[PDB]
């Protein structure tokens, strides 16, 4: 009956307990800090061989090998220093929308409109590549997948859920609920102990892999969120949405600090990533080009225009020497 | 300049070679996307041919391989995955003719038709319309007239007229009548032409595309 009241009142407390913890307006704190200026990058490599749109990519921890997934029914592995193909995995479902590369390097994963996360083993005798598990139990469509170790993996689905599995059996060890919309983005933390999800109800949520409870909920957007990434300190993240706007959220303050926007930018955002230092945030847009932002002043610092169609995926490597962008034009591009 | 690394290139070339053969082959099939009103005819249309998310149906007719994608078991935000099909050869759209009396359904079917035909991704994609269940439409006329659905309908309450009125009220919903065509068909139980019609329409589409490629449209 009156249960729909205490919540509202209760919510009004939060809206006030995070307005007294706001005094600095970071854009003011970092007013004297020396700017970065302007950043020029150049296409060093171009990786050809895909016959359709590529919908995702992922780097390896060696900072040399990467994997890409396309809707031609192909998952290709590349040496980036030569442009040589190490493996080409043919899938059963051409409708793939995500990919991952295990930290060790023995496994990859894929998924999409079939509602199944398929794990593939690369380092096996017989000199082939075999599917080891087909994790099923979702009802939507796989929108992201991330490894914790070689026997654990987190998944997000368009059924308003996320899940933590156990690959040896193939059963959900935990199921994360609370969203009211298709979930579209994931980011794990450095410690691989608490992760963050970004949904189409214009919200983000911070989970806790150990228990299964949402510790904090973040709002502020005016449309669907499609991308999210963690700051390297593990104490902040960034979100990209269809309102042509990125935002930075802090966990402890439980607010947002900076918004990254521009009047002459009206397209949506498909991807987000940081730099090894956490000083320049990269973003992939639908206007066919990527942009670079100074994440302490909100100014721009550079543009990456080499693609003849949407930038769907964007990644940065753990050593910090390169960026890789993917496009619907069936091309990946390395920048330095 | 190199080493046994040479053998790592001779490999990357045996890979780049099979991707071609996979694309020089997946380009001679025809991909179709199947949509329809809520549980109207999207099922019987498949059984008319004799061969968990998306359902792929592969079949063949006169040395031409068709792949039909049925995605009704995918209840989600369609705005987020309906661009995976941009580049599909055609859209089959199945609507019924016994759905005006029932409940109102023809109106939402037309809403979906207008939401699909006039989409950013299907500005060039042709549509094959199947108006099905005409046998029963013959009976739901005598008892119930048509004006119960379309007030502005002022004409002979008969098959050869109401069917054409529905056809027109469906076909006058494409705003870009100059870039895509709409093919329409009333289904026959036996004498399986429901697939010869698809064959004709598809070959017409293919010719109309080859002629645009050759710059002498």
């Amino acid at each position, epitope marked *: 009956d009156q249960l729909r009241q205490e919540a509202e009142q209760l919510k009004n407390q939060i809206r006030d307990a995070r307005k007294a913890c706001a005094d600095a307006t970071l854009s003011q704190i970092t007013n004297n800090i020396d700017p970065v200026g302007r950043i020029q990058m150049r296409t060093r490599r171009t990786l050809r061989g895909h016959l359709a749109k590529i919908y995702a990519m992922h780097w390896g921890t060696d900072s040399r090998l990467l994997v890409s997934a396309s809707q031609d029914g192909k998952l290709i592995i590349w040496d980036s220093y030569t442009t*040589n193909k190490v493996h080409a995995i043919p899938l059963r479902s051409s409708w793939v929308m995500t990919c991952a590369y295990a930290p060790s390097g023995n496994y990859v994963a894929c998924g999409g409109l079939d509602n199944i996360c398929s794990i593939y083993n690369l380092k096996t*005798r*017989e*000199g*082939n590549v075999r599917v080891s598990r087909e994790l099923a139990g979702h009802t939507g469509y796989l929108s992201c997948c991330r490894f914790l170790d070689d026997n654990q993996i987190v998944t997000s689905s368009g059924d308003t859920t996320c899940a933590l599995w156990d690959i040896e059996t193939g059963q959900q060890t935990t199921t994360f609920t609370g969203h009211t919309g298709d979930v579209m983005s994931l980011s794990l933390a450095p410690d691989t102990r608490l992760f963050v999800s970004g949904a189409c109800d214009a919200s983000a949520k911070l989970w806790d892999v150990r228990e299964g409870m949402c510790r904090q909920t973040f709002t502020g957007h005016e449309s669907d969120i499609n991308a999210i990434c963690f700051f390297p300190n593990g104490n902040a993240f960034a979100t990209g949405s269809d309102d042509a706007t990125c935002r930075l959220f802090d966990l402890r303050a439980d607010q947002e600090l900076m918004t990254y926007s521009h009047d002459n930018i009206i397209c949506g955002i498909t991807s987000v990533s940081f730099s090894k230092s956490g000083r320049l945030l990269l973003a992939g847009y639908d206007d066919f080009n990527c942009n670079v932002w100074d994440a302490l002043k909100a100014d721009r610092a550079g543009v990456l225009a080499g693609h003849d169609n949407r930038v769907s995926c964007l990644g940065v490597t753990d050593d910090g020497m390169a960026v890789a962008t993917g496009s619907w034009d069936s091309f990946l591009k390395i920048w330095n | 300049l190199s*080493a*046994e690394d040479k*053998a*790592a290139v*001779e490999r990357s070339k045996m890979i780049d070679r099979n991707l071609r053969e996979d694309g020089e082959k997946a380009a001679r099939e025809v991909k179709l996307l199947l949509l329809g009103a809520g549980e109207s005819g999207k099922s019987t249309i498949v059984k008319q041919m004799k061969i968990t998310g998306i359902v792929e149906t592969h079949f063949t007719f006169k040395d031409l391989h068709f792949k039909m994608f049925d995605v009704g078991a995918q209840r989600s935000e369609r705005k987020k995955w309906i661009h995976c099909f941009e580049g599909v050869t055609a859209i089959i759209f199945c609507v019924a003719l016994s759905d005006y009396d029932l409940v109102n359904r023809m109106h939402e079917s037309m809403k979906l038709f207008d939401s699909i035909c006039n989409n950013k991704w299907f500005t060039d994609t042709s549509i094959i319309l199947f108006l099905n269940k005409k046998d029963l439409f013959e009976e739901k006329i005598k008892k119930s007239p048509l004006t119960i659905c379309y007030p502005e309908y002022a004409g002979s309450n008969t098959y050869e007229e109401a069917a054409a009125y529905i056809q027109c009220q469906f076909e006058d919903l494409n705003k870009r009548k100059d870039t895509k065509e709409i093919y329409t068909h009333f289904t026959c139980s036996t004498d399986t032409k429901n697939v010869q019609f698809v064959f004709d329409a598809v070959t017409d589409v293919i010719i109309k595309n080859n002629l645009k490629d050759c710059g002498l449209f």
Partner: single-chain antibody
Amino acid sequence: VQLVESGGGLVQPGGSRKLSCSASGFAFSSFGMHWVRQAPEKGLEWVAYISSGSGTIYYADTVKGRFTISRDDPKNTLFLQMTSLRSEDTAMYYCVRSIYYYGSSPFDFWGQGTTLTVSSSDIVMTQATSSVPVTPGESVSISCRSSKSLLHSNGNTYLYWFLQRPGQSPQLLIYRMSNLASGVPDRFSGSGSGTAFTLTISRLEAEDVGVYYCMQHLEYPLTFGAGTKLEL
């Protein structure tokens, strides 16, 4: 995984022969294939190599013109045709698999061999020592010397360490002077810098006694060492 060779027996000088290697348990088509020899009381010498796709072949300067290597992939078989046999060809022949991509372990599986006997600008890898007695429990080291730096511009150092036990076939221990194969304990370690390399064995144990061999994969032809024996 399996590799069975056949086609060897007593023949006469001037004759001809054909040896066959049947594979069972792996993707024969994705693997390049080698033939290797071992004379009765001597070391290992290389013979021929054919790639995946067969669009690349290499012979030694001792058999060119009178040998021919081929492969039938549909039937998973490797062939060596030999003409004009001399007494310098009595040996045990071994069929070897090798796959090349970033991070691969070539020369990983060998066969059991065919014993043939007929009636009566290259790198030089040197293994000074030829015999070493030891006791189970202590540590050991073995040294290899090359007449040319094996390090390359890409950063890789192409040296391979093999082990042959009494009455068995060789077995890859180490590839590229630092990497350890799949199926060998951590006792074995590799080290060194161009023109000199070292293998270290700690907390020794039985079954580690036999003949150790050095190999280079920098440029064809390929070359082995004389073989360092390690017994009790």
